[PDB]
Structures are given as structure tokens and as C-alpha cells.
DNA sequence: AAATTTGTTTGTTAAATGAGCAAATTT
DNA sequence: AAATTTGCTCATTTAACAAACAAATTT
């Protein structure tokens, strides 16, 4: 049914799968909670910043540094991929 | 004085440790493990859409959550995400949030 | 009766793309 | 020594943008 998922344990020590989208809902339920109406500004860039980096690490780890297969896996262009590598100084 | 909160620490999730103790790990680690899990279970099948897959799994709840916050208001939501109100309206359509 | 937000459009800017190449690098 | 990937470039398609503004809505 749904492919991006993370392991959760309940009080009965049962491990169990739960979408990543549910974790993001939580990270942000929390983000806002701990603000007290202080303006947010760049939340799109913030969330994305934190999602691109682990995606890039993990697909470069998988494709043994091969930038070319990485781009093909992710479905982005070799250029794009490089640019993003510079952005996070991952090169 | 104020204490440093690194960017990893700004979006965080509730994890339990080897001592049955609740603690806040970065969201980025949850993304890392989602993908680890994902590769393990792939078994040499070709992939061609992993960016668009991760993006969809992430934008959908970023949107869902921000529009709850602005009690449905598209203008503030776009100001507070940092994107043009047109993109926002477009992304919202993309997932039928209207 | 405001003030704001929506829904839609326009022209402009910025980003992403594909193709091409020599020169490194892996095979 | 052949095959592939890198590190550029250029040019082209596509997305994101800010600025409008009448019509609907919320204050």
C-alpha cells in the first residue's frame, strides 16, 4: 500500500510501521506548539532543507557516490543534483 | 542567556530508547530511516521517482498542517511558508486540499 | 462600510532540463 | 583499451514569481 514508513514501538513492546507523513505532522505539531504566535517565515525552505539532506546522503550512499545513477533514481537532472550537493556542501 | 538549538533540533520527533525513555530525535533521522527501510525492501528493482516520492510524502502534511494553523487562510499560509500564493494554490490543488 | 482575501491574469525572473564535450576515472 | 562518469557549457522548456484587480468574504 504505502512505501515510506518508520518503526514505532507501543507500550506493549510491539514494533510497528507508521507513515513518515505522520511523523512530519508531528514534528510540526510540535514546532507550532512551542512557538507562541511568533511569526514563521520560511517554513517551506525549512522543511525541505531537512528532507533533502537525508535523501541525498542515502541515495549517494546507495549509488556509491555515482552522481549519474543518483539523478536517475531520484528522477532529477545531473545538474540539479550537483547544485543541491553544493547547497548543503555535500560535495 | 539563550541556549543554542541547532536546525536539526527545530523539527523533532518522539523516540523511546534502550532504557524505555522518551526523547526527541531530529526529523531528518526519521527521513533517513524511512529510506533505509525502503532500500532494504526494494531488492534490486529499478527506481525513477524517489525525489517526487519523498517530496509528496513531506509537502502533503506540511500543507495540511499550515492550513489548519491559518484556519484555512491561503494568504498567510503562503507568507509563512515563504512561497508565492500561486504556488500554494497549485500545490493545494495537486493533493486536492480544496 | 471597511479591510481583507480570493480567484484569476499578466509579464518577468529563476530553476530545471537535455544535449554536447573533453578530460578524469572505473571497468 | 573500452565504457562510463564527471565537470563543465549553452540553449530551451517549465516553474515560481510579483502586481494587478474585480468579486467574494470576513472583520
Swiss-Prot record, chain A:
Region (Required for the stimulation of HIN-mediated recombination): 10-37
Keyword match DNA-binding: yes
Subcellular location: Cytoplasm, Nucleoid
First-listed, main subcellular location of the protein, grouped into a coarse class: cytoplasm
One GO CC term, this protein: cytosol
Gene Ontology MF terms in the entry: core promoter sequence-specific DNA binding; DNA binding; DNA-binding transcription activator activity; DNA-binding transcription repressor activity; protein homodimerization activity; sequence-specific DNA binding; sequence-specific DNA binding, bending; transcription cis-regulatory region binding
GO biological process: chromosome organization; DNA-templated transcription; positive regulation of DNA recombination; provirus excision; regulation of DNA-templated transcription; response to radiation
InterPro entries registered for this protein in UniProt: Fis_DNA-bd (IPR005412), Homeodomain-like_sf (IPR009057), HTH_Fis (IPR002197), Trans_regulatory_Fis (IPR050207)
NCBIfam families, per the entry: PRK00430.1
Subunit note: Homodimer.
Main function: Activates ribosomal RNA transcription, as well other genes. Plays a direct role in upstream activation of rRNA promoters. Binds to a recombinational enhancer sequence that is required to stimulate hin-mediated DNA inversion. Prevents initiation of DNA replication from oriC. Binds to hundreds of transcriptionally active and inactive AT-rich sites, approximately half its binding sites are in non-coding DNA, which only accounts for about 10% of the genome.
Record family assignment: Belongs to the transcriptional regulatory Fis family.
Protein name per the record: DNA-binding protein Fis
Organism: Escherichia coli (strain K12)
Record lineage: Bacteria, Pseudomonadati, Pseudomonadota, Gammaproteobacteria, Enterobacterales
Chain's gene name: fis
Amino acid at each position: 500500500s504505502d512505501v515510506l514508513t518508520v518503526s514505532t514501538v507501543n507500550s506493549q513492546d510491539q514494533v510497528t510501521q507508521k507513515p513518515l507523513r505522520d511523523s512530519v505532522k508531528q514534528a510540526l505539531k510540535n514546532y507550532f506548539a512551542q512557538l507562541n504566535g511568533q511569526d514563521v517565515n520560511d517554513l517551506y525552505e525549512l522543511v525541505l532543507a531537512e528532507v533533502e539532506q537525508p535523501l541525498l546522503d542515502m541515495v549517494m550512499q546507495y549509488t556509491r557516490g555515482n552522481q549519474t545513477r543518483a539523478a536517475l533514481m531520484m528522477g532529477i537532472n545531473r545538474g540539479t543534483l550537483r547544485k543541491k550537493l553544493k547547497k548543503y556542501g555535500m560535495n
